[PDB]
Amino acid sequence: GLKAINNGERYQLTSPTAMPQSASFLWNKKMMIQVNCRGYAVAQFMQPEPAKYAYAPNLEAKTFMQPEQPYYAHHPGRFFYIKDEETGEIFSAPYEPVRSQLNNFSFNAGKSDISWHIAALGIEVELCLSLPVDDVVELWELKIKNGGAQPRKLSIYPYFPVGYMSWMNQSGDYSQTAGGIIASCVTPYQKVADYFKNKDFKDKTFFLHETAPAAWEVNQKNFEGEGGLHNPNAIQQETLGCGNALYETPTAVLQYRRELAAQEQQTFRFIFGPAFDESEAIALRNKYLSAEGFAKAKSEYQTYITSGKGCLQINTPDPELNNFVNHWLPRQVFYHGDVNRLTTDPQTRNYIQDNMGMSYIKPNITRQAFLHALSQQEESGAMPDGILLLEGAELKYINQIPHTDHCVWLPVCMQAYLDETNDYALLDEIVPYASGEKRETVEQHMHHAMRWLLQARDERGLSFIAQGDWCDPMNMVGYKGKGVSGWLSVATAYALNLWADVCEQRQQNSCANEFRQGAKDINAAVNKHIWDGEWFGRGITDDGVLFGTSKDKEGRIFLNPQSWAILGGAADEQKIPCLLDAVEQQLETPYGVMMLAPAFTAMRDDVGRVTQKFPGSAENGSVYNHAAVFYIFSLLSIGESERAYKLLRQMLPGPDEADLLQRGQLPVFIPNYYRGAYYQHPRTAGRSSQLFNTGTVSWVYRCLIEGVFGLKGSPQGLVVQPQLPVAWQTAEAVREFRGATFNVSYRKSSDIKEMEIQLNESVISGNTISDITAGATYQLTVLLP
Amino acid sequence: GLKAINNGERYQLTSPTAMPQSASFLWNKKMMIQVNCRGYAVAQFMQPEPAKYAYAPNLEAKTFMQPEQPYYAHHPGRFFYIKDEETGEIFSAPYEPVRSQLNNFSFNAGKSDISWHIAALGIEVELCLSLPVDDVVELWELKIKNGGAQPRKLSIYPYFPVGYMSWMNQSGDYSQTAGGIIASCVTPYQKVADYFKNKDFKDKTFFLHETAPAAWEVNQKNFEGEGGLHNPNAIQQETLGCGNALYETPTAVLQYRRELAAQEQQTFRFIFGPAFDESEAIALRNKYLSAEGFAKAKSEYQTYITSGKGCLQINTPDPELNNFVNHWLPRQVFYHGDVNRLTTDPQTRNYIQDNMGMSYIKPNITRQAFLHALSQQEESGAMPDGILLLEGAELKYINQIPHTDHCVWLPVCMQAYLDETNDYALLDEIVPYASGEKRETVEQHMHHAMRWLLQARDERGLSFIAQGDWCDPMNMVGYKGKGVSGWLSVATAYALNLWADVCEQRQQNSCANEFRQGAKDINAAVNKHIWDGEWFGRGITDDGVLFGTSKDKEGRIFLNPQSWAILGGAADEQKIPCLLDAVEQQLETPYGVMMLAPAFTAMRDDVGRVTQKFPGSAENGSVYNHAAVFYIFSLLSIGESERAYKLLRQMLPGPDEADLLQRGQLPVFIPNYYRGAYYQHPRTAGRSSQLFNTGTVSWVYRCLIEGVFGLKGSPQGLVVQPQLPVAWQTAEAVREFRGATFNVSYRKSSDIKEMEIQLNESVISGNTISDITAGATYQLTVLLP
Ligand SMILES: O=C(O)[C@H](O)[C@@H](O)[C@H](O[C@@H]1O[C@H](CO)[C@@H](O)[C@H](O)[C@H]1O)[C@H](O)CO
Ligand SMILES: O=C(O)[C@H](O)[C@@H](O)[C@H](O[C@@H]1O[C@H](CO)[C@@H](O)[C@H](O)[C@H]1O)[C@H](O)CO
Ligand SMILES: [Cl-]
Ligand SMILES: [Cl-]
């Protein structure tokens, strides 16, 4: 079974085998953890760069998680073994590593915690994980109850494998003074500069108990012996051996021996995490490891999540949609803008898009993000490929490979901020540039960005692509310096048209004319060179080849140039229906719209690395949700209400059982992708990546707020412009907007020919609520034909 | 049990649990594999840089093996499951992953193969692995026999897990045309230049059968199901499901169904390895996958190993020593010089030392190695930190961090070559330098190297250490440009004294004087600044601190400055006994001599990274065999015969049972280290690193040939100078030397006061056999007091 519980606070799966990849996530200001339903977990923290405290059993690469991450028996996880001392029978919570028969299983994804209930052998177990807001530590609460009528003698063994920490130096031992296990290493390196750089690393891992145990074991191999994780030798014997690790793989295993009366329950607390030294571990222990410490952290964390609850609560005829939107969407949006994906150098397009989502949650964060991003703009007007969030950080990985699209996001996402807040006064703030002495207003910086986009075009008037655009791995179209992007061109026309509208609102009329003319020039170039007759191509290679066209067998159509041609005006009214039909025919699937099709099955080396991905995975033809929601937004922009909703709703798994089993995910987030290549590889199509990091969700939230429910800001007030699916006879929403609350009731009427709006029971004229007082509540009734 | 079998060809362990880390190795011109006794394996190949075809289940770091490498259930390996179709009972060969009760177990390390015999359920299994000489492929032969009296219906399942190949693209499927499983990936990258660089990668892994199977499975998770590796679901059912992998972790599993008569045995052949494409896999199949192909490869491989058999066979009163020296030592030496550790940029000290070993095996390889190494000498005289073996290769890892000792090895190892071969004519060969147009003789290059060592000294006359010397991770003594090395100084005096002796043999008298004077100057500086009263210090830091002294609590004495002071002449007759005693008191252990003591337990940042290793591991205080044999060689140089032999013999595990169990290794190689820190951490002391890559063995072979058995070359012929341990009443050796064979019999006599030598039964005068005819055999009798 799989359903919402606890009044929306949690979401419960009752089989540990039906959906074995399913998972949920938690984060805080400094860490994140992905927890699998069977007890595997991946945890990363910042110090200030990424690191981990629970390691693989081998020397793993520097990485967090892969899409569709597979687990294996020794993957890091969070386990508790229970042993009936009378019978010798054992089981483990949550399910791994023993995989015993259980009488009851629940995995509960929470807004603020992750928990399990299980039962075996008549013993009832509860496990609850949460994090505090500001420190790196896991708070673990275990409850064990004898559910039967006679006393029961049990051994209870936390098993938190530390893994292979380092080939230079790893060890571990029990510390009575810390009250638990302290594993220790030295992170490997070779260069002297790295010794200086690594000085403040938290290269100890602690596992501390509140209640002193009977015994412990710190050596992984001693724990397993021949019995392995299925039946550890250390657990077969009466008492753990109390061994240490001396350049041996360390582990964290404790043992409690209890005789529990009928119906008796006992609670045990632990914390797990990294530390510089034992002193820091003890500081965490004193702050957190108690009933009071756990309750204070929980109260503070629930407060943090509620601070990010957002501006929209809905009550539609679709209860799965209600649950997702009300309870899960805003937390996922909030994570992205609040901690910027836990990177010290966010990709600029990610920083600006994730902060755009924040406009609906905590817009002062958005405001400061624009100020920060623009302070790092180059004097040319160009934006850097990443934005540094800490002095001393550097551009890493894809951010060192030249992509050309960074400036497009500025006005595209500023428009959401300005519409929601009406904070045009941001445009007057003064900020520096990345180099030089010039300090200019936001508005001037934006003009220089749009001038950059206009200058970074070839003689045909089309945008250079270099080693990629929005599609990060699209690296061989323009690497010789001549290739151009179809998508970047259409999106630059959109950006320029939006920014000209701002300039016109600001009385910057010369600018408005200049950018409007820019946008027409690009659109005309696009129509001349990129349009392929039934859809827009994707780009022109360094050697002059148009691709993403009907002559290409793989990558015959890409979604992005279509959505963005719709938004930026390259697609007129006669080309629009060609796009809709071609997308439906070639890209739509039951799991959502694919970003390109057919997927590439081999390298095409004038397009590049994207074509080497497995067909259907990631940018190579998946249902890549971020591209899908750009299409949904383009659809809303032209009033294609039914098609917009249909494709948005496809992003949420369930309630169809086959759908839920095939995507394999709990419906508590939208992943970066569901597997595509639907025609080529049907068996796997729909499978969830399980990756909760995705720019999709800022845009999905915007589409629902402003487009489907149609409650959008303007300089006059709240614009009522709903695009509800026709199946809905009635719906309600509660919209928070500029400090006020709107209780909106939507109802279909066959008495009217045109929408009618009532505010506090009086019919209004027009579609705008203009008189908004902070702290007030308004009743809005919207009757629709 | 653990013993030599097959007339020395193999070495057999009969418990899969007593020595669970034990392992043996195979190599060829392009690959190596370390095979664990329970069925785990690590395999690397060159194309021309390192790569693998069997992956971990996660995204592993670029690495081969760690010292004391731990395994875990999903580590790569080489397995076969047997299922009794009547009972459903299963077991796996060799032992993992099921770990069933077996009725018989043998793991056979071979000179040219690795094999197992096991039995369970009345079924007798044989497994044999070997490699061809020149292609990258594993040749696997499986035999299954019903050892009982009634027919038996069995399913037989090879299980060769491919692992997690790539996050960009991984897959696999069955190919009837190839006749087996083909897994495929694209190695991840981001930079366009890497696409060009990676073009010829063998990114397919094949598992091909000679005999067509009943069924197959390519998806790892489908193979395991809930049952895991202990009881795979695919094996529970009647027939494998014939599944593929589509961006899922692939595997190689086949199934044969057989009804075997009483006493019936069947043979099945497979090959496993990497390929560019199916065409290459089929080429390997046609060449190898047959009884004829396996026999041709085996015959060619045994020939290759016999070509490396070396120059010394011994018959001593110690049968463990005999076995090791005769059967295992020469193959380990041969590996090092023949394939240079499978790196395209060997560390210069490793290249020169490993090639020195070759002087006793195939000296033309040694000769060409000096020619190659010196062609890359810098015009200054300095040697580079590595030697490039392929055009386009680069210096990697430690070779990019400046170390100062590279030139010292030239005359130290040239001396062995000249003594063995008498090829002074090498000195006349003309070779270029790394830059510039100068082409000079070997002799001139050597003079420039020794002038470099003399110039690279401070005002005190001591050698700069920069970021390290022989001790690779000794990186913080001289990183600011002032620190100097105690060891490098004493070894430079040795190098100069040897090279002056060559110059004197070559009538280069000015050079002889110049370098002899250099050596005295350095030795005097060493005695003034480095000698600490009872032993020589290790170095002086940038801030002027002498370390490796009696005032240091950790790192109180280092072995190297003592051995090298003995060799180079810094240690006179009055200081020698102080060194011997201090080494005995502080560094000697039952497992061999430690390289420093007490081990460092925390960073000391004017010594550096070495001090951060776990105490007792690697350079931080292990029994680091390469340093140990430098001491043994220094001992032989002063006639400390008993102490030399004792410490050399300590390098060979066994026959003491406790010793064999504690080191945990088969006695078929000498590892780079046995764990030290004997006083600080007794529990783990002696544990083998299991690393067969080590420069130790060229020197151990030289010590036995020239020092213990005392059969050493000179410009006059064969010098007889034995240092046998006194316990030996008699011994024999067979020495191959300059094309002739010497059958040497050694016998102790109380009738003589001084050694007597007879050649073909006539007493000779002096200690040199001067008349050596190629192809002849001589009988030498050496009577000792
Ligand atoms: O090859 C790769 O590493 C990966 O495919 C990344 O490019 C990708 O990264 C995303 O790829 C999007 C589409 O290319 C891009 O618009 C976002 O800015 C970037 O965060 C992943 O979602 C990161 O999890
Ligand atoms: O920190 C490290 O990576 C390792 O300790 C290496 O330095 C070491 O490498 C050896 O270390 C020796 C002593 O330092 C050195 O003389 C040899 O040239 C070098 O091959 C290993 O034996 C490679 O397996
Ligand atoms: Cl795209
Ligand atoms: Cl040393």
DSSP per-residue string spanning B281-319: HHHHHHHHSSHHHHHHHHHHHHHHHHHT--SEEEE-S-H
Number of neighbouring beta carbons within 10 Å of residue B437: 7
Q: Whose CA is nearest to atom 22 of ligand 2?
A: B672
- What secondary structure letter does DSSP report for A382? P
Name every protein residue with a CB atom under 6 angstroms from any ligand 2 atom.
Answer: B 347, 349-350, 398, 470-473, 618-619, 672, 691, 693
Q: How far is B167 from chain A (nearest CA, A)?
A: 6
Residue type, B314: I
- Mind giving me the DSSP string for B598-629? SPP-S--TTT-GGGGSPTTSTTTTSEEHHHHH
- Contact (CB, 8 A) for B739 and B775: yes
Give the rounded distance of the alpha carbon of A595 from its chain centre.
19
For A9, A503, A570, the CA distances from A515, given in Å and listed in that order, are: 47, 9, 15
Mutation site for A-interface testing, chosen from B75, B226, B247 by largest number of A Cβ within 10 Å: B247
| Chain A CB contacts of B17 below 8 Å | 226
* Edge-to-edge strand ranges of the sheet holding A152-160: A90-93, A79-84, A152-160, A250-260, A215-219
How many C-beta atoms lie closer than 10 Å to residue B260's C-beta? Answer: 19
Q: Is A672 in the pocket of ligand 1 (CB under 6 A)?
A: yes
DSSP string, B460-521: TS-BB-TT-SSSTT--SSSTTS--EEHHHHHHHHHHHHHHHHHHHHTT-HHHHHHHHHHHHH
Structure tokens belonging to residue A300: 């503070």
- Catalytic site residue B472? yes
Q: Which amino acid is at A162?
A: V
Choosing from B338, B385, B405, B472, the catalytic residue is B472
Chains A, B: CB contacts under 8 A, how many? 151
Please say whether the dihedral angle defined by the alpha carbons of residues A329, A333, A335 and A341, taken in this order, is positive or negative. Answer: positive
Name the residue type at position A391.
E
What gap in Å lies between CA B340 and CA A314, rounded to an integer? 69
Identify from A72, A400, A675 which residue to disrupt to test chain B contact, counting B C-beta atoms within 10 A and taking the largest count. A72
The residues facing B43 across adjacent strands are: B33
Residue nearest atom 10 in ligand 2 by C-alpha distance? B472
DSSP β-ladder status, A768-769 and B23-28: unpaired
Q: Who among B17, B169, B249 is closest to A613 (CB)?
A: B169
Instruction: Report yes or no: B221 and B234 within 8 Å, Cβ to Cβ.
Output: no
3-class DSSP state of B30: coil
Q: Report how far residue A672's alpha carbon sits from residue A697's, in angstroms, rounded to the nearest whole number.
A: 9
3-state secondary structure A569-627: CCCCCCCHHHHHHHHHHHCEECCEECCEECCCCCCCCCCCHHHHCCCCCCCCCCEEHHH
Inter-residue contact A483 to A542 (CB < 8 Å): yes
B448 HSE (CA, 13 A, CB side): 20
CB-based burial of residue A386 (10 Å sphere; 0-12 exposed, 13-18 middle, 19+ buried)? buried
What are the residue ranges of helices labelled H in B215-290?
220-224, 233-236, 278-288
Interatomic CA distance for residues A56 and A54, integer angstroms: 7
CA of B472 to the centre of ligand 4 (A): 9
Dist CA B206 CA B135 (whole Å) = 14
Among candidate residues A251, A196, A192, A242, the one with its CA nearest the CA of residue A220: A251
CB of A161 closer than 8 Å to CB of A76: yes
Q: Which two tokens stand for residue B195?
A: 């696409």
The Cα–Cα gap between A260 and A277 comes to 37
Q: Is the N-terminal amide bond of A655 cis, ω within 30° of 0? A: yes
Which residues of chain A are within 8 Å of residue B72 when distances are taken between CB atoms? 57-58, 73-74
Q: Give the list of residues 6+ apart from residue A238 with CB closer than 8 angstroms, or none.
A: none
Output the CA angle A475-A476-A481, nearest 5 degrees: 100
Strands annotated E in A344-503: 430-432, 439-441, 484-485
Give the N- to C-terminal CA distance of chain A in Å, as an integer: 39
What is the enclosing helix (H) or strand (E) of B632? helix B625-637
E strand segments, B111-189? 114-120, 123-130, 138-146, 152-160, 170-175, 180-185
- Rounded to 10°, the helix B442-455/B486-505 angle is 150
* Nearest-angstrom CA–CA distance, A467 and A482: 11
A491 Cβ inside 6 Å of ligand 1? no
Ligand 2: distance of its center to the CA of B335 in Å?
18
Q: Extract the tokens encoding A294.
A: 């756990």
Q: How far is residue B325's CA from residue B319's CA, in Å, rounded to a whole number?
A: 10
At B563, list the tokens: 């051995």
Query: Contact at 8 Å (CB) between B385 and B395?
Result: yes
Contact criterion met (CB < 8 Å) for B169 and A612: yes
Cβ neighbours of A784 (radius 10 Å): 19
What are the two backbone dihedrals, phi and then psi, of residue A144, each rounded to the nearest 5 degrees? -130, 125
Strands A740-748 and A777-784: parallel
Which amino acid, residue A744? Answer: V
Residue A10 CA to residue A3 CA, distance in Å, equals 9
Q: Look up residue B19 and give its two tokens.
A: 């020595």
For A646, the token pair is 């249909």
CA distance A677 to A620: 8
> Among candidates A582, A576, A581, A577, which has minimal Cα distance to A556?
A582
Identity (one letter) of the amino acid at A630? F
The verdict on a CB contact (< 8 Å) between A401 and B220 is: no
Distances (CA, A) of B534 to A493, B485, B493, B588, B634: 82, 18, 20, 16, 17
Q: Which helix (H) or strand (E) holds A566?
A: helix A559-568
* Domain ranges, ordered by start, for chain B: 1-277, 309-317+710-785, 318-709
Q: What is the DSSP letter of A386?
A: B
C-alpha separations of B360 from A678, B15, B349 in Å: 64, 36, 18
Residues in B closer than 8 angstroms to A169, CB to CB, are: 612-614, 617
Atom 19, ligand 1: which residue's CA is nearest?
A472
Give the residues across from B60 on adjacent strands.
Answer: A60
CA–CA distance, A159 with A216 (Å, rounded to integer)? 10
Q: Name which of B169, B168, B172 is nearest B180 in CA terms.
A: B172
Helix (H) or strand (E) segment spanning residue B266: strand B265-275
CA distance B223 to A409: 46
Contact predicate B739/B774, CB 8 Å: yes
Burial (0-12, 13-18, 19+ Cβ within 10 Å), A43: buried
CA distances from B181 to A376, A769, B207 (A): 52, 67, 5
- Tokens 């008993």 locate to B642
Rounded Cα distance between A198 and A184, Å, is 15
In sequence order, the 6+-apart residues with CB closer than 8 A to the CB of B363 are B417, B420, B421, B423
Burial (CB < 10 A; 0-12, 13-18, 19+), residue B201, is middle
Q: Give me the phi and psi of B329, to 5 degrees please.
A: -60, -50
Q: Which of A74, A169, A397 is nearest residue B72 as measured by Cβ atoms?
A: A74
Token pair listed for B443: 């002799």
Count the alpha carbons within 13 Å of B711 in the hemisphere toward its beta carbon.
Answer: 26
Would strands B50-51 and B79-84 be described as parallel, antiparallel, or unpaired? unpaired
Tokens 């059958």 — which residue? B743
* CA distance linking residue A563 with residue B500, whole number of Å: 80
Instruction: Return the closest-CA partner of residue B614 out of B686, B681, B550.
Output: B681
**How far is it, in rounded angstroms, from Cα B495 to Cα B493?**
6
> Do residues A651 and A628 touch, judged by C-beta distance below 8 A?
yes
CA distance A48 to A200: 10
**Exposed/middle/buried for B713, CB within 10 Å: 0-12, 13-18, 19+?**
buried
Closest chain B residue by Cα to residue A219: B70
Task: Calculate the alpha carbon distances from A83 to A80, A105, A144, A157, A235 in Å.
Answer: 10, 18, 12, 8, 8
* Peptide linkage before B48 cis (omega within 30 of 0): yes
Q: How far apart are CA B426 and CA A138, in angstroms?
A: 67
- A294 CA to centre of own chain: 26
Give chain A's count of helices (H) and strands (E).
Answer: 19, 40
Which tokens sit at A205?
A: 């891992």
**Cβ atoms < 10 Å from Cβ of B226:** 12
Please tell me the distance between residue B478's alpha carbon and the centre of ligand 3 in angstroms.
53
Contact B113, B129 (CB under 8 A): yes
> Across the interface, do A58 and B56 touch by the CB < 8 Å criterion?
yes
- Provide, as residue numbers in chain B, all residues whose Cβ is less than 8 Å from the Cβ of A186: 612-613
**Pair of tokens at residue B97:** 């992953």
Beta carbons of A510 and A646 less than 8 angstroms apart? no
The DSSP letter of residue A281 is: H
CA distance between the termini of chain B: 39
Residue A618 in contact with ligand 1 by CB distance below 6 A: yes
Tell which one of B347, B472, B698 to mutate to probe ligand 2, the residue whose CB is within 8 A of the most ligand atoms.
B472
Distance (Å, whole) CA B116 – CA B35: 11
Active-site residue, from A135, A354, A472, A606: A472
Elucidated via = X-ray
Residue of B nearest to A57 (CA): B72
User: Which strands make up the sheet holding A41-46, listed edge to edge?
Assistant: A23-28, A31-36, A41-46, A50-51
Q: How distant is the alpha carbon of residue B674 from its chain centre? A: 14
For residues A108 and A114, is the Cβ–Cβ distance under 8 A?
yes
Strand partners, B185: B170
Q: Considering only CB atoms, which chain B residues are within 8 Å of A607?
A: none
Discontinuities after residues in chain B (C–N over 2.5 A): none
CA B285 to CA B272: how far, in whole Å?
10
* Ligand 1 pocket test, candidate residues A401, A405, A472, A487, most atoms within 8 A of CB: A472
> Encoding tokens for residue B439?
């082409």
User: Angle A85-A86-A88 (CA atoms, 0-180°, nearest 5)?
Assistant: 60
Protein residue with its CA nearest to atom 5 in ligand 1: A618
Determine the Cα–Cα distance for residues A783 and B12; give it in Å rounded to an integer: 87
> What's the rounded Cα separation, in Å, for the pair A164 and A248?
8
The strand pairing partners of A730, in sequence order, are A747
Phi and psi, residue B153, nearest 5°: -105, 125
**Angle, in degrees to the nearest 10, between helices B409-421 and B442-455:** 150
What ligand is nearest to the CA atom of residue A625? 1
CA dist., res. B671 & res. A77, Å (int): 34
Strand order, beta sheet including A170-175: A2-5, A10-13, A104-110, A114-120, A123-130, A138-146, A265-275, A204-209, A180-185, A170-175, A245-246
A496 touches A519 (CB < 8 A): yes
The torsion region of residue B315 among left (phi > 0), alpha (psi -120 to 50) and beta comes to beta
Give the pairing type, strands B740-748 and B777-784. parallel
Q: Nearest CA of chain B to the CA of A102: how many Å?
A: 14
For chain A, give the number of residues. 785
Q: Which residues of A touch B57 (CB under 8 A)?
A: 70, 72, 75
Q: Smallest CA–CA separation between A70 and chain B, in Å?
A: 8
Cα A53 from Cα A161, distance rounded (Å): 10
Q: How far apart are CA A394 and CA A573, in angstroms?
A: 46
Chain B residues within 8 A of A75 when measuring between CB atoms? 57-58
Q: How far apart are the CA of B472 and the centre of ligand 2, in A?
A: 6
| Bridge partners, A90 (sequence order) | A83
Closest to B442 measured CA to CA, from B505, B510, B369: B369
Residue of A99, A247, A616 with shortest CB distance to B247: A616
Question: B170, A614: Cβ pair inside 8 Å?
Answer: yes
How many angstroms does the Cα of residue B364 sit away from the middle of ligand 2?
A: 27
Provide DSSP, B349-411: HHHHHHHHHHTTT-HHHHHHHHHHHHHT--TTSPPPSB---STT----GGGGS--S-GGGHHH
d(CA A216, CA B168): 41
- The two structure tokens encoding residue B218: 């390519």
**DSSP type of residue A310:** -
State the Cα–Cα distance between residues A282 and B718, nearest whole angstrom. 70
Q: What phi and psi values does residue B90 have, to the nearest 5 degrees?
A: -130, 160
Compute the distance from residue B380 Cα to the ligand 2 centre, in Å: 26
| Exposure class string for B340-365: b at 16+ Cβ within 10 A, else e | bbbbbbbbbbbbbbbbbbbbbbebeb
Q: Are B590 and B656 in contact (CB under 8 A)?
A: no
Alpha carbon separation from B574 to A224, A291, B534, B545, B569 (Å, rounded): 55, 70, 10, 26, 12
